[PDB]
Amino acid sequence: KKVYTTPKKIKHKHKKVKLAVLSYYKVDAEGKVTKLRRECSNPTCGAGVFLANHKDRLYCGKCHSVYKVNA
Amino acid sequence: IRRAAYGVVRYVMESGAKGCEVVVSGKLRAARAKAMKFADGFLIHSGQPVNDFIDTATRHVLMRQGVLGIKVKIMRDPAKSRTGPKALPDAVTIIEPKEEEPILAPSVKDY
Amino acid sequence: KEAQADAAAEIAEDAAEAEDALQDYLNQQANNQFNKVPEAKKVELDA
RNA sequence: ACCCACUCGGCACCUUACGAGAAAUCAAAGUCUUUGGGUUCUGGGGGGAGUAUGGUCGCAAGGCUGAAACUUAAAGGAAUUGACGGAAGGGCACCACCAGGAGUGGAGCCUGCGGCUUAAUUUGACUCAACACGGGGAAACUCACCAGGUCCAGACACAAUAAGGAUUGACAGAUUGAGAGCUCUUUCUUGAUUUUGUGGGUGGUGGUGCAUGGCCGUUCUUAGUUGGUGGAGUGAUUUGUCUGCUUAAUUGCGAUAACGAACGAGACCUUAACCUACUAAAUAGUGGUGCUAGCAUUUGCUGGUUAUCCACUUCUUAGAGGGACUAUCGGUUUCAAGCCGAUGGAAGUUUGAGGCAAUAACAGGUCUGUGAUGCCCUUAGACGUUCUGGGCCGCACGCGCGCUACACUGACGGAGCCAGCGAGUCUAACCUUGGCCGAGAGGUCUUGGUAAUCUUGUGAAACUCCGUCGUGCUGGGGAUAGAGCAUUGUAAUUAUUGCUCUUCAACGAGGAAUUCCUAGUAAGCGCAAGUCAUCAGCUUGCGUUGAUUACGUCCCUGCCCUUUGUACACACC
C-alpha cells in the first residue's frame, strides 16, 4: 500500500470538564433557599431543569437544542 | 476420512439404495487439496432418469484446518418407484412363453 | 470393518427407535394484574 | 551337372517344451534342495577407483599386478503400467482445408486491453482456453482509487474512574464544502446505558485461487472406464477392450480364448414440425341469424354491433392419444453391420435444435457473489463505516470486439404494409391506447391492464410501388463543431439521452495477415428481454427476406488412436 502520510495536527473529542455543579441555589440565611439560575418554560422540562447564562443567552440544556428563551 | 465415508456408504446401501456415491474434497492435515470418491452398487449419471432416481446434496464442513466438501449422491431402486416410472428407459423385459402340447387331431367340444 | 460395524449401531439406533419406550402467571396479562396504583408521582410548573 | 533317400561332421533357422529362469528368454542358459561326470578363471552392496603405493614391461603414450582411509541406503536387473518424444503407421472437424459466401484486417466513431499521463486515473484476466470478459452500459450510489470531514455499530471478561457525577446532547458564535457541537468560546443538560486500560472480539472489494469449499472454463465439435465366470503371467498385469469393415459414437458387423455384462454414447428430457380423429373455450375463433352502414341493384359485393341469440372447433389454444421404425422397392458391400438412389410420407442429415452428460486431468479462473472459508494483515489519525468533491471516460501511440460508409441491387420524398420471442403497477406510479397543445423532442386531461381480457394486429425493419436525383466526394457518407428547445435524475459542467438548424471530415472496395459458415443455414433486417431513474454501437432470444458453394479430401492447422523409445513417475514446467 502506502502506510501513513498525514500533515500532523490530530484532534481530541471531549473532556465534559469537571465542574462540582450545583453550588447554585442561593440561600440568604437559615434556611431560606432563593434558587439562582431560572428554570425552563416547556412541559418536557418540569422546572427541575434550568437555563444557562451567556451573553444575550438563556439556554435550556434539557431541550438538547429547542426553545431559545431570551431575557 | 474413510471409516466415516465408508460407514455412510454401508448404511445407505443397506437402506436399499440401488447405489450411492460419496465425495470428499478439501484439505486434511496436508497443505494440499486432495479428493476421494466413494461409490457402490449402481448409478446412472445422464438423462432424465437423473432427476428421477439419483438425489444429490453438497455440504460445507468447516473445520480448524479449513473447509471440506461433502458431495453425497444416492440412487433409489427404480422398482419401488411408487409414483413415477418403475424402471430406467434402458430396461426391456421379454415375457417368457410356455410349453405347448401340439398336434391333437382337431375334434371339438360342446356346451 | 470399523465402517461396517459403524453401520451396525446405525441400524441399532434405528431399530430400537422403531419401538423404544404450569407456572400460571402469564406476563402478557401480569402487567394488567400489576396495573394497581400508587406507582408514581407527578407535580411541576413553578415560575 | 541335376533329383530322391540315408549317414557322419559344419554355418544357421523354424516350431514346441517335457524342463530352466527374476524375467527378457534359453536345445542349453535343460537333466540343481530329488543339490556331486572332469577341469580352469572371475565375482561377493553402491561410491571412493582401476585412484594411491610398490614391483615389472615399454622409446614414448601407456600394459600387467593393484590397496586403504573415508563416504553412502541403496546403486542395479527384467518386466508391468502410465506420462512424454523435434519416431513410424492409421484417423477425425469449416473453432482444419477444399468449393464458395459474407467479412474483419484500410476509413470515422463506439467499446474493451496495453501504454503514457495522473492527486487518483481501483482492480481481476494475457495463445485457442485474456482483450462488447467479471453479466463491468461507473454522473451520486455503484466504489475497491484520490483530496478532505464524521461516527463505533470496539460483543463480552477482569480492572480502573465515579453517585460530591461514570457518561450523554446542544442553542448561537468561531469554525467548516456543509443548519456536522468535528473542534473551540460560554454552561445548561444528561444518570451508570458510557468511559480509560488489558484480555478478547468484530468489520474489511485488505494479502494469499500457490492454503481451501463451492462453482465454472478447458482437455472434450471427445469416446472412453469397469467388474463376473474363463484363457496367459510367480507377479504388477493381461485377454475381453481386436487387422479390417461400418457409425457422429468402444455405434455396430465381422474376426476371435473368450463368453456374456454395467457407467459414458444410445435410450431419456425439452422445444420446433404433423392430426377436418378424442376432451373444450366471451380471456381464442369461424359459419348462420337479429341489429346495422356503403356501393349496386336481379339474388350480390364491403364493413360496424365484448353478449340480441342459435350451431360449430378448420384456423388459435393444451390436456390425452396417434405417428417414424431411415418404411416399400431397388442398387452396392464379407450380399454382414451399413451405405446410396427412387416412390410414398408432416417428417427419412442422431427428423432439425437444444438440455443431461462417466473415469480423469489444470497448481486454469473466481477470497472483487456469498454471514462459504484456513492463515496473514489491519482494527479509532481504521485497510471498519459514512458524508462532500474528483477519478474509473484522463491522450503523442500499439492491440482487439463492434457500428456506420464509400452509393444507381442507391440515397431521398410520397405511398403499398407484413412477424415472432417477451414484459408490464400494492400498499403502487409499471405497460400505456385514446382527445387535445406542439415542427420535433415532448406536454396535458383521461382511460384499459396484476394481463390469451388492456398497451398490441406491438401496422418493426429490411422489403414492394410512383416519383425527385444522374455520376460529378453528388442530394453517397455523417465525423467534427457552433447555436437553441426538451426529458431522466438532488445533481447532467468533462457536454446522460432526445429534438431543430448550421458546420459537411475520413472514407472511390482496403497490404501482409485472419475470423465465420453447408438450408429456412449463410448473410441482410428490425423487434423483445437482461442491464435500466436516464444511457446499447453490447448480449440473450425472436421472427422477417433468403442465396452462391461442398457433400469431399488429409495439403495446411488442431486433436485423438495404435506402434515404438525412455535413465521421466512431482511423469519434458
Ligand SMILES: [Mg+2]
Ligand atoms: Mg446409460
Ligand SMILES: [Mg+2]
Ligand atoms: Mg444422452
Ligand SMILES: [Mg+2]
Ligand atoms: Mg514356462
Ligand SMILES: [Mg+2]
Ligand atoms: Mg477457401
Ligand SMILES: [Mg+2]
Ligand atoms: Mg478476403
Ligand SMILES: [Mg+2]
Ligand atoms: Mg469476447
Ligand SMILES: [Mg+2]
Ligand atoms: Mg464518494
Ligand SMILES: [Mg+2]
Ligand atoms: Mg455520526
Ligand SMILES: [Mg+2]
Ligand atoms: Mg478495547
Ligand SMILES: [Mg+2]
Ligand atoms: Mg489487542
Ligand SMILES: [Mg+2]
Ligand atoms: Mg468479505
Ligand SMILES: [Mg+2]
Ligand atoms: Mg494474484
Ligand SMILES: [Mg+2]
Ligand atoms: Mg486453481
Ligand SMILES: [Mg+2]
Ligand atoms: Mg478451486
Ligand SMILES: [Mg+2]
Ligand atoms: Mg460444425
Ligand SMILES: [Mg+2]
Ligand atoms: Mg486395448
